[PDB]
Design an enzyme around this catalytic site. Structure first.
Site, mmCIF file in Angstrom:
data_model
loop_
_atom_site.group_PDB
_atom_site.id
_atom_site.type_symbol
_atom_site.label_atom_id
_atom_site.label_comp_id
_atom_site.label_asym_id
_atom_site.label_seq_id
_atom_site.Cartn_x
_atom_site.Cartn_y
_atom_site.Cartn_z
ATOM 1 N N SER A 1 0.806 -1.214 0.000
ATOM 2 C CA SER A 1 0.000 0.000 0.000
ATOM 3 C C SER A 1 0.847 1.276 0.000
ATOM 4 O O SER A 1 1.916 1.332 0.628
ATOM 5 C CB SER A 1 -0.947 -0.011 1.209
ATOM 6 O OG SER A 1 -1.943 0.983 1.077
ATOM 7 N N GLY A 2 0.351 2.296 -0.697
ATOM 8 C CA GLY A 2 0.986 3.613 -0.729
ATOM 9 C C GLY A 2 0.087 4.677 -1.328
ATOM 10 O O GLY A 2 -1.054 4.401 -1.690
ATOM 11 N N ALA A 3 0.620 5.888 -1.458
ATOM 12 C CA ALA A 3 -0.146 7.048 -1.919
ATOM 13 C C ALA A 3 -0.789 6.877 -3.299
ATOM 14 O O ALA A 3 -1.892 7.380 -3.530
ATOM 15 C CB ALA A 3 0.724 8.307 -1.890
ATOM 16 N N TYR A 4 -0.103 6.176 -4.202
ATOM 17 C CA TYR A 4 -0.558 6.031 -5.581
ATOM 18 C C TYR A 4 -1.321 4.732 -5.862
ATOM 19 O O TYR A 4 -1.715 4.459 -7.006
ATOM 20 C CB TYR A 4 0.621 6.177 -6.541
ATOM 21 C CG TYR A 4 0.796 7.595 -7.055
ATOM 22 C CD1 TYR A 4 0.048 8.054 -8.145
ATOM 23 C CD2 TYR A 4 1.695 8.475 -6.453
ATOM 24 C CE1 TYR A 4 0.192 9.353 -8.626
ATOM 25 C CE2 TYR A 4 1.852 9.784 -6.929
ATOM 26 C CZ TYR A 4 1.097 10.211 -8.019
ATOM 27 O OH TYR A 4 1.234 11.494 -8.505
ATOM 28 N N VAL B 1 -2.170 -2.990 -3.386
ATOM 29 C CA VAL B 1 -2.041 -4.230 -4.154
ATOM 30 C C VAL B 1 -2.568 -5.421 -3.362
ATOM 31 O O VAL B 1 -2.382 -5.501 -2.134
ATOM 32 C CB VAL B 1 -0.569 -4.462 -4.646
ATOM 33 C CG1 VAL B 1 -0.485 -5.633 -5.616
ATOM 34 C CG2 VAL B 1 -0.020 -3.215 -5.343
ATOM 35 N N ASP C 1 8.176 -1.901 -11.698
ATOM 36 C CA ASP C 1 8.308 -0.743 -10.825
ATOM 37 C C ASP C 1 7.226 -0.793 -9.772
ATOM 38 O O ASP C 1 6.052 -0.527 -10.051
ATOM 39 C CB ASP C 1 8.275 0.574 -11.620
ATOM 40 C CG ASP C 1 8.718 1.768 -10.797
ATOM 41 O OD1 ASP C 1 8.409 1.818 -9.584
ATOM 42 O OD2 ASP C 1 9.383 2.662 -11.369
HETATM 43 C C1 LIG Z 1 -0.015 -5.120 -10.019
HETATM 44 C C2 LIG Z 1 1.100 -4.282 -10.638
HETATM 45 C C3 LIG Z 1 0.800 -3.384 -11.663
HETATM 46 C C4 LIG Z 1 1.801 -2.602 -12.243
HETATM 47 C C5 LIG Z 1 3.124 -2.718 -11.794
HETATM 48 C C6 LIG Z 1 4.261 -1.959 -12.368
HETATM 49 O O1 LIG Z 1 5.365 -2.497 -12.389
HETATM 50 N N1 LIG Z 1 4.031 -0.736 -12.928
HETATM 51 C C7 LIG Z 1 4.998 0.067 -13.544
HETATM 52 C C8 LIG Z 1 4.875 1.443 -13.362
HETATM 53 C C9 LIG Z 1 5.811 2.314 -13.937
HETATM 54 C C10 LIG Z 1 6.881 1.818 -14.693
HETATM 55 C C11 LIG Z 1 7.054 0.431 -14.917
HETATM 56 N N2 LIG Z 1 8.161 -0.072 -15.634
HETATM 57 C C12 LIG Z 1 8.449 -1.529 -15.570
HETATM 58 C C13 LIG Z 1 9.322 -2.059 -16.726
HETATM 59 O O2 LIG Z 1 10.413 -1.182 -16.869
HETATM 60 C C14 LIG Z 1 10.026 0.084 -17.369
HETATM 61 C C15 LIG Z 1 9.124 0.823 -16.355
HETATM 62 C C16 LIG Z 1 6.087 -0.423 -14.325
HETATM 63 C C17 LIG Z 1 3.426 -3.631 -10.770
HETATM 64 C C18 LIG Z 1 2.423 -4.394 -10.204
HETATM 65 C C19 LIG Z 1 2.748 -5.334 -9.119
HETATM 66 C C20 LIG Z 1 2.806 -4.858 -7.810
HETATM 67 C C21 LIG Z 1 3.090 -5.746 -6.770
HETATM 68 C C22 LIG Z 1 3.312 -7.108 -7.082
HETATM 69 C C23 LIG Z 1 3.613 -8.200 -6.264
HETATM 70 C C24 LIG Z 1 3.807 -8.212 -4.763
HETATM 71 C C25 LIG Z 1 5.133 -7.531 -4.346
HETATM 72 C C26 LIG Z 1 5.130 -7.288 -2.838
HETATM 73 N N3 LIG Z 1 4.967 -8.527 -2.062
HETATM 74 C C27 LIG Z 1 3.999 -9.518 -2.586
HETATM 75 C C28 LIG Z 1 3.850 -9.615 -4.130
HETATM 76 N N4 LIG Z 1 3.712 -9.262 -7.125
HETATM 77 O O3 LIG Z 1 3.499 -8.882 -8.378
HETATM 78 C C29 LIG Z 1 3.246 -7.541 -8.378
HETATM 79 C C30 LIG Z 1 2.963 -6.683 -9.403
#
Ligand SMILES: Cc1ccc(C(=O)Nc2cccc(N3CCOCC3)c2)cc1-c1ccc2c(C3CCNCC3)noc2c1
Length: 347
Positions: free
Chosen positions: A29-32, A35, A165
């Site tokens: 969890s955070g400002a933006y 999950v 990210d």
């Molecule tokens: C659901 C989700 C949606 C979007 C993103 C996400 O990565 N968004 C994003 C935003 C800005 C830039 C980029 N780039 C990535 C590639 O390189 C160029 C820039 C990516 C990431 C996730 C995300 C968040 C958390 C998790 C987790 C948890 C991590 C913390 N502990 C439990 C699992 N597993 O899989 C996840 C995907």
């Protein structure tokens, strides 16, 4: 056809998701945004679902929302996070307020790996190879990560890696903090217009840390960190100095006692000489002179993994929107179009 949605409260947040997603569990969890881990009964996949927090509250937020969705829709590469699904409970643009992003669920990150496991040179070869393979792709689309660090690299049990990210402020870059340890010096100190080469600095820092088990530049603050960097790579020459367009930063760095580049074989004791060579080509202060991802893939350090026929580039990515000024509702409508046109990964 629109799926049926169901509602639950998850840590004083309403989640309204298609029935196909079950066993929602908060994981960040955070400002933006925030999950949940979930189970996609349709695909049998373990997934992460990110509910964006206040996606359209301001022009800056609205544009950022549009930016992330465009990026995730485009990224289709084995070593780069991709989009399984995107949805909204809204039935029309008029009632559109919430955006949910679905990806594969990640397990351990590279911090976990470095902290708990010991890495052989083969492990380092494979991990860095996959970062660069992913970066080659990302950079071919003229996307700069800008925040590469161990916590943004997910690694499965088979040591397979994805760049993401998880980012969800000046204070956040302040002090003895991993949020700054992997940043290129030109961005840390706002030297000049930066570019994709910033990400290669970060890879150099990550690689050194895989090799030693220790942070390469764990600065206690921006200045202490610069001093750590310059101790290793040497103080800048005249050529780089004229490139520092910030006259303030240029004048500060010129006040420092000149120092030569250190012997990297004496810093990275026992390391594969090819890894030493590669680090020397990554950790160059002048970003113009840094090895690129595409170049690094062909470095002899990666001989065991390098396959020039399986190192793909991205389809053309139109980011003309980055220089466009629009109203909240216009960013919102563009984002809406992108939600409803989404097509899931085939098979
Ligand atoms: C659901 C989700 C949606 C979007 C993103 C996400 O990565 N968004 C994003 C935003 C800005 C830039 C980029 N780039 C990535 C590639 O390189 C160029 C820039 C990516 C990431 C996730 C995300 C968040 C958390 C998790 C987790 C948890 C991590 C913390 N502990 C439990 C699992 N597993 O899989 C996840 C995907």
């Amino acid at each position: 056809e629109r799926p049926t949605f169901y509602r639950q409260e998850l840590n004083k947040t309403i989640w309204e998701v298609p029935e196909r997603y079950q066993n929602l569990s908060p994981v960040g969890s955070g400002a933006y945004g925030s999950v949940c881990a979930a189970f996609d009964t349709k695909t049998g996949l373990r997934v992460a679902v990110k509910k964006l927090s206040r996606p359209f509250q301001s022009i800056i937020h609205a544009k950022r929302t549009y930016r992330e969705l465009r990026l995730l829709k485009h990224m289709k590469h084995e070593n780069v996070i991709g989009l399984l699904d995107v949805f909204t409970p809204a039935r029309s643009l008029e009632e559109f307020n919430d955006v949910y992003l679905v990806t594969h669920l990640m397990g351990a990150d590279l911090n976990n790996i470095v902290k708990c496991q010991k890495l052989t040179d083969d492990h380092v070869q494979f991990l860095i190879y996959q970062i660069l393979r992913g970066l080659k792709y990302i950079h071919s689309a003229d996307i700069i990560h800008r925040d590469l660090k161990p916590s943004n690299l997910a690694v499965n049990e088979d040591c397979e890696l994805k760049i993401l990210d998880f980012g969800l402020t000046d204070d956040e870059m302040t002090g003895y903090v991993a949020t700054r340890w992997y940043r290129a010096p030109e961005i840390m100190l706002n030297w000049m217009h930066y570019n994709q080469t910033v990400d290669i600095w970060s890879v150099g820092c990550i690689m050194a840390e895989l090799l030693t088990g220790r942070t390469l530049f764990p600065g206690t603050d921006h200045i202490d960190q610069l001093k750590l960097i310059l101790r290793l790579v040497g103080t800048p020459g005249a050529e780089l100095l004229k490139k520092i367009s910030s006259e303030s930063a240029r004048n500060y760095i010129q006040s420092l006692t000149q120092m030569p580049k250190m012997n990297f074989a004496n810093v990275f004791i026992g390391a594969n000489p090819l890894a030493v060579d590669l680090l020397e080509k990554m950790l160059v202060l002048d970003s113009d002179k840094r090895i690129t991802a595409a170049q690094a893939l062909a470095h002899a350090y990666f001989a065991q993994y390098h396959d020039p026929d399986d190192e793909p580039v991205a389809d053309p990515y139109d980011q003309s929107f980055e220089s466009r000024d629009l109203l909240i509702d216009e960013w919102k409508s563009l984002t809406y179009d992108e939600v409803i046109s989404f097509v899931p990964p085939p098979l």
